[PDB]
Amino acid sequence: MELFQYMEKYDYEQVLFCQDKESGLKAIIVIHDTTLGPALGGTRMWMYNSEEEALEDALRLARGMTYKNAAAGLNLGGGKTVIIGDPRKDKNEAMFRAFGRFIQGLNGRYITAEDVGTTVADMDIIYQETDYVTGISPEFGSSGNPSPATAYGVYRGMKAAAKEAFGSDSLEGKVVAVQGVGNVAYHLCRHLHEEGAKLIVTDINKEAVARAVEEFGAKAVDPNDIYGVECDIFAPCALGGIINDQTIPQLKAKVIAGSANNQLKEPRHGDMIHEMGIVYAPDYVINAGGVINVADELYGYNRERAMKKIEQIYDNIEKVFAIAKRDNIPTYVAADRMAEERIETMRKARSQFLQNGHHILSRRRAR
Amino acid sequence: MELFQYMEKYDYEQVLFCQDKESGLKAIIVIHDTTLGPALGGTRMWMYNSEEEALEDALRLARGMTYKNAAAGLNLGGGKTVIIGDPRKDKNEAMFRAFGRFIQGLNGRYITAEDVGTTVADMDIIYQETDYVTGISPEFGSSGNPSPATAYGVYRGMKAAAKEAFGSDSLEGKVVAVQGVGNVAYHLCRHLHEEGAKLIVTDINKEAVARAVEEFGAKAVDPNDIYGVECDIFAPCALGGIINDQTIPQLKAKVIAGSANNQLKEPRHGDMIHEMGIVYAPDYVINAGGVINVADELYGYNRERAMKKIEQIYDNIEKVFAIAKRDNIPTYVAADRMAEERIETMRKARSQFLQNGHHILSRRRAR
Amino acid sequence: MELFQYMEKYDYEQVLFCQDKESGLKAIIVIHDTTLGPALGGTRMWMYNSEEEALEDALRLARGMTYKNAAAGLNLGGGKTVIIGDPRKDKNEAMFRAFGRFIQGLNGRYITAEDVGTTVADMDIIYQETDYVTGISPEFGSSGNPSPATAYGVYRGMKAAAKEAFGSDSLEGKVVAVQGVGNVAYHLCRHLHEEGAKLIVTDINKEAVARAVEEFGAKAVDPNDIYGVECDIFAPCALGGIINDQTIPQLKAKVIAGSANNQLKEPRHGDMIHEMGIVYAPDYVINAGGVINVADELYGYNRERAMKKIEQIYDNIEKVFAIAKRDNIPTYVAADRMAEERIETMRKARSQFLQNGHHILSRRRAR
Amino acid sequence: MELFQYMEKYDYEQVLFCQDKESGLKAIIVIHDTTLGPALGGTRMWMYNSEEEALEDALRLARGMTYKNAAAGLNLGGGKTVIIGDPRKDKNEAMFRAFGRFIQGLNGRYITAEDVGTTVADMDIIYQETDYVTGISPEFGSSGNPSPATAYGVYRGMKAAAKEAFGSDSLEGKVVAVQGVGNVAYHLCRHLHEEGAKLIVTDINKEAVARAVEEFGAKAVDPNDIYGVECDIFAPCALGGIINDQTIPQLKAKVIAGSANNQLKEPRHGDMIHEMGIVYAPDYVINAGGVINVADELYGYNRERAMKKIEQIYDNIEKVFAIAKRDNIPTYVAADRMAEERIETMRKARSQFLQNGHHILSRRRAR
Amino acid sequence: MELFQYMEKYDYEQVLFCQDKESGLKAIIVIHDTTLGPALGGTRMWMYNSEEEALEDALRLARGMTYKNAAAGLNLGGGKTVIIGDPRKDKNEAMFRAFGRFIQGLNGRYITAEDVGTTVADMDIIYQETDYVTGISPEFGSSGNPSPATAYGVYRGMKAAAKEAFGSDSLEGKVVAVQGVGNVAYHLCRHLHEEGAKLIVTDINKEAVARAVEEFGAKAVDPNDIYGVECDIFAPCALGGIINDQTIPQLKAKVIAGSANNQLKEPRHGDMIHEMGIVYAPDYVINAGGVINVADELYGYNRERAMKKIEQIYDNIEKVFAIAKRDNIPTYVAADRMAEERIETMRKARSQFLQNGHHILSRRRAR
């Protein structure tokens, strides 16, 4: 792969190959940047055809978590673990005890969470070997549902995009097209219905569409023609790779703001959306409520402080649009430049010496 | 006794004779294996005819607690204390203060609990001299009833044995024969009645049988002919030494799963049950809910985490049956081999160096 | 390279790629086994044609340091760092400050020393960022010359091989052929002359040969015909890859024991030496005095304790010959099996629980 | 300014100029006296025409906070921060992270709170860098409303002034003139109405006056003629510089006790009030309930302990009147002499040596 | 002075005015940059006509100590204290106890040393109140003479300037003109005489010139005509403001390298020297041996480590000349750019997260 070239181009700090033979563990922990704080990242378990696929996947997701943690306003870096295996036939206790000791061998330099492949029962075997794991506690296990947080963040980001494209943030009388009636999208439809906006929903499964029509008064629409529905705000919440050459000329909308990951298939499509005047708020800034929710657990979990932090996605999208109007660049470039300016400024502004400095893992006064 | 021969055959770590003259304490603390964690064990007070009886008793119970803690999924070893005395005439404060200082002189290498002979008022005099005692707190003193936990574990293990012998774990329409209407068995009958299974109960006392018939709708059966009752699942919950040559040819059942200790009188009877095709789930894996409940107190007691751990006795019995079908061995051998493979694998998989490793007694972040 | 296959075959714990862009650091830290203690290893700086050459080099040297630390009697594991660069044009302060922070980010799990490529001025920039570096102190900087220690170890190992092949360890009247008149070999010739043995020396440089003939009374021999000199003990001290098909049929000797690294070019040549009856003491057991000398610094450096530990290379070679006579195997296999049996036995014998255990990095009482 | 002369006249301990260029921070932290405890002070952000205006402002407010903390009965000193900037256009995260590191660089010698210019969202960016900030917690964020505390203190001080001027503290049947129907004054009117006193309220805004007349039964009076209303107690709660030559000969009252800051415009007006026999309780002793409320958070916030401490403003005003009758001096001089005698006595009475002394920032037993 | 403008232009971190009335202390502590480490600076006591003179003096010396500590290779920042008073009539114990408590109130952020005005008896009263003072110990009080260290640094820097201007660093046969026969210059003449260089010395006092002629064989030259002496290397060691318009056209030399502070009166004279081809090594890089000697005490004082660090002034002057030839700039600009590039690179290269990082004040393992 010529792996030091790919590390040197983007300034990756570490790549770290864990292996344990008596448990079958093969893990790749990738740390991109730990300037702001410790590298928080998910632990993803998935079977690959080779090692290089897992390596490329971990490197891309480490860079993405760096920009997500930086733009969210968190004192956390970017990293990502990929465990190579099958999560249906190749899990046991011994590989997560070994992996928790490898995380404890980094001394808090990398904090792990759950992701595609692992559940919160594997982040309890790891918790037996380390503190540097989030999503573990009975407090977050009770009052820490990730999907209302993610939907509340999508709500605030859609308010900010509405005030950008319309002048006022009031959605009372708007037509919101949502695909997927998953948990995040269902709580999003609850927030939009309690505001009093007209909703048009769809999903692959007919049962969730029927539940949404019975509850919040929407239109049962086929999943193939949600793009051509005349609306203001389109909120994609199902998959990625949506916006491509097949799907651009069907949008009758002008605002795209949803909880989907990797929404732009290629950056040229973001350039095309920037040409067409469709207000695109970027993907990893809107849906950043769940990472804020799992990162607030490090303080000792409290729901009011967490939701008060999730409220600021409004101001985050507002700063993205301010930088995009300032430099006359597309908004997916504006979000990256927002995150990089925050990293550079917090390196140059936290430079004076202290021998008792606080960070995200410091043990401080209870109060 | 030739005591180093008996220690060398089974690899007992320590035997330790405590004595205090001004209080009358004579105690035998036996630690078998501390590979997984500290040796948790009960403190049992009972009058013996000699020293050698107490020594043999402590050695057998230390080995049994090793296999119980290993098969339960706990990071705890196996030990056992025997205090030689009479618990009706030979208790005072001074022997438990002396004994708590002898436990503090092991530095957390042995953790004690209550057992036959002691109450939770003697594990409060010990708590004045040590932290290494469980069953002490007002939190566990309020919400830590051992018998609903033990019955919930017997419930889950009976589900696993039902899915082994029947195909599905649903007991809606099954005939469960229970002897003893003690507290564990009464909560077990509550769980089985809320599921909707037909129950047949008996006990030595007529009053508990009358209470069970008034509450959960069962048959008042004499204690001598519970064995010949035609049923699917027999749940022994009264004493040990039940299954012997007198009692084998009366079983019309095919599943034995109860909360009784030392159910097989001799291992040849387990070989006979393995010949007859009666699905025997082993005794120290089913009834392991109480040890999980008193071991969850070491984290700071929380009922939801404890019951979430007690739920896994289903998967424990499932692994016992998987190993028994894998090696074509009886299930009481399969449980021992499950526990020994867990001990060997956790020795070989937690071997990499850390200078800040966590264990069951570590002081960690609150969160 | 299919790097998890090569890790899984030999049970490598970690490989770890460090990178720093504003300093130009590209480093590969490889940790093989940390069962006995922390992984002590050299930091080697050398320019490679690719990444894969550096990776293979670090993996081989990590395995070699594991067996060297295990056979020496040290509570240390095996690792190795390779920095990819040129040590004549590509050193500055910033890469060693970055690299010292990457060592501090392992939390004592890896301890570094100097090797081919670095000096003890680069292990002073690293010492500003970490404690986990050896060869740093003014005490070891004064009284810690590595070459008298390595020569004293070669002296003791040659005594053990002499008692194996001759019956008595007295070399008073023996003919020792030494190639290279480097510092280790010069102190070795001093020890052999103070014992009273007849010496035959050679070197590539004529000046060192002239110094050796003026000082210790030897024969100025050409470097090409040292192999055919009739002697008892041949002590190679210059390079590796010596014993090959070109050089086997010239030996008139019967004992090979020198301070050279990688003496057998291929293991088939060790099989041939085992056929011919030439007593071969293995290479990484004889010359292990320098690693003992730099590992004794971790206690606080003391010359008498260090030399008392270097004395035991006699007993180490004696155990290698005991295992080789026991299993009827060649001695280079016997040294590997000695080291592996020490690792397995110290894993199975240090298994009982302690919450205050000591290791090589523990802070203990001064006394 | 000849700044050491102005420091030497009043014994200011420190003035400290913070600056950060990449964030735009220009701050002046002034510490007057830290005899009683750490210097608690507000952080005030306001735009000045020069540096010297900000310097004079910080020095005056540091002296005022010294006397306020001393007369309140708190173990806290006096300080004050002035940040030079515009709080509408010149705030970002980087200046408060820099400023929190400058507070952490004082090591608990200065504790900050919010004031005119900052909100409790800027004392959350500072909380990421330090512990020495109050008004931060979700406990104080829920149950720590400052205005009921300040009104409860004004209530108790008005009771003490009523017992001074009338003989009994019962206000059942008195006429209380209040200007401003702000939050402190509205809760004050609630306390006075639940006691059963006749109220006469006014404010600049007509809506608050209408709310007060609808709720507590008062007279809607114009803001210009509240001074000439015949009453017993006048409670100014709007601004400062009230009592001047234009406003003295309109008072038909005899007790002045309100929550306003800097009530006497010049001390000669306090001399005139002392001549006229109008009982003036001093301004920084009555309204000291909010500083007590934000200072009780340092113990771990508890509402009952805080209100039990706010109750003692009765005894504080009683001691001010005792000293004023003792030395035949005006009451604004009596409050300063009360505070200075407390500082001198607590310096001379806490002088005996301890090597484990407690202060406001000590970490002590939970209990 | 408009003091925030002068701070903002050069990025001064803090200015801090200490005052104590019962002891008469008036002190100005100025911290310029603490990026590399804690701000080490001298404590200078001198009587000024005003406050602004002392303020300007402290600001200039803080910037100068920043560049001196950065170019020397030390992990220390730049600061400076000025105490306003008379060191002949206005010293007592109480002002230095008060001042030591003000240094302890910075928590290691500023480390003090002696300078013009204070002795090492006032840095023993301060040592009673703080650890952050250097020049205190009996070890440095015995073996820590500053003048042999400063002369050894001037020796190495003159070697580097000789290899720049001549090709080889050998001074055997060169003519070195030295003014001042102070302690630094006397040890410098000892080093140059033991090398075997021809010396020409002068001083204001005739006795030191007579001692130098009796000891090292030089020429007794009048102090006014040392500039016109034909020589290679001129080593000014008496005062500053030497090189001005009156003194430029008398130099028959080509190398200027001495221990004097502020040698160039104005930077235009450095431009003139850069035009004339006279090799000027900069002043604050050559004479930096004393600051290295007092900064090595923070590790626990050891003479060999200190002199091994003072040896590198050779490489420091070599890097100054490399940057000056690289950018075609004068050498006094090249030294500032060397120091600024070291500060920027060590900010960008020590950026990865650690929660146990080492600095100059860390308590680490003895070894």
XYZ file of C-alpha atoms in Angstrom, chain D residues 74-216:
143
model
C -17.501 34.090 53.676
C -13.988 32.639 53.647
C -13.223 34.350 50.367
C -11.131 37.286 49.250
C -11.716 40.039 46.783
C -10.822 40.194 43.124
C -12.261 41.119 39.746
C -11.537 40.424 36.094
C -12.192 42.896 33.297
C -11.979 41.578 29.747
C -11.560 44.414 27.249
C -13.756 43.713 24.247
C -17.254 43.800 22.865
C -19.545 40.988 24.112
C -21.686 41.259 20.961
C -18.980 40.932 18.286
C -15.771 39.716 19.974
C -16.440 36.380 21.664
C -15.197 32.965 20.617
C -14.100 29.722 22.239
C -10.380 30.406 22.013
C -10.270 33.445 24.286
C -12.097 31.627 27.071
C -9.897 28.539 26.722
C -6.859 30.829 26.933
C -8.401 32.673 29.882
C -9.219 29.429 31.684
C -5.596 28.381 31.339
C -4.533 31.724 32.796
C -6.847 31.100 35.769
C -5.427 27.583 36.176
C -1.987 29.215 36.138
C -2.843 30.966 39.413
C -3.445 27.610 41.210
C -6.744 28.362 42.899
C -5.647 31.781 44.141
C -8.473 33.370 42.104
C -11.989 31.983 41.546
C -14.202 33.469 38.833
C -17.949 33.933 38.415
C -20.216 35.591 35.890
C -20.975 39.295 35.873
C -22.059 42.047 33.450
C -20.782 40.924 30.070
C -20.593 37.153 30.391
C -23.248 34.434 30.595
C -23.317 30.863 31.824
C -22.149 29.528 28.510
C -18.773 31.246 28.722
C -18.327 29.798 32.207
C -18.468 26.361 30.549
C -15.640 26.961 28.128
C -13.605 28.160 31.115
C -14.729 25.081 33.067
C -13.064 22.909 30.419
C -9.720 24.412 31.457
C -10.114 24.909 35.226
C -12.003 24.042 38.395
C -11.805 27.586 39.746
C -15.095 28.797 38.335
C -18.518 28.932 39.958
C -21.966 28.904 38.429
C -21.238 25.882 36.250
C -22.961 22.784 37.548
C -26.266 21.186 36.546
C -27.163 21.245 40.257
C -26.674 25.009 40.473
C -28.026 25.196 36.918
C -31.298 23.698 38.158
C -31.850 24.800 41.766
C -29.555 27.836 41.901
C -31.635 30.809 40.750
C -29.781 33.914 42.026
C -32.764 36.296 42.279
C -34.833 34.438 44.956
C -31.652 34.272 47.032
C -30.967 37.992 46.600
C -34.585 38.817 47.435
C -34.481 36.581 50.525
C -31.396 38.469 51.664
C -33.088 41.831 51.040
C -36.059 40.477 53.026
C -33.901 39.600 56.053
C -31.970 42.880 55.912
C -35.211 44.837 55.760
C -36.385 42.912 58.845
C -33.217 43.969 60.666
C -33.592 47.617 59.618
C -37.255 47.484 60.673
C -36.305 46.223 64.131
C -33.690 48.986 64.319
C -36.022 51.831 63.348
C -39.327 50.532 64.777
C -38.590 48.195 67.688
C -40.146 45.055 66.232
C -39.337 43.313 62.961
C -43.004 42.747 62.052
C -43.892 44.458 58.771
C -47.599 43.559 59.016
C -49.085 46.953 58.233
C -46.165 48.822 56.634
C -45.864 50.723 53.363
C -42.933 49.599 51.204
C -42.014 51.662 48.138
C -40.148 49.655 45.483
C -38.756 50.954 42.200
C -38.023 48.430 39.481
C -40.153 45.288 39.104
C -37.177 43.186 38.068
C -36.773 39.576 39.176
C -35.184 40.363 42.554
C -37.797 43.034 43.221
C -40.632 40.750 42.077
C -39.597 37.980 44.479
C -39.141 40.671 47.156
C -42.725 41.811 46.566
C -43.823 38.163 46.844
C -42.103 37.837 50.243
C -43.561 41.145 51.452
C -47.051 40.187 50.273
C -46.898 36.773 51.950
C -45.911 38.590 55.131
C -48.830 40.979 54.673
C -47.313 44.400 54.013
C -48.774 47.177 51.869
C -46.757 47.617 48.678
C -46.259 50.498 46.239
C -44.327 49.514 43.121
C -43.022 51.194 39.993
C -40.785 50.410 37.024
C -39.719 51.928 33.711
C -41.768 49.331 31.806
C -45.556 49.467 32.116
C -45.960 45.696 31.654
C -44.064 44.738 34.819
C -46.044 47.324 36.805
C -49.284 45.854 35.428
C -48.124 42.340 36.372
C -47.256 43.512 39.895
C -50.643 45.216 40.344
C -52.477 42.121 39.053
C -50.502 39.793 41.323
C -49.709 41.453 44.650
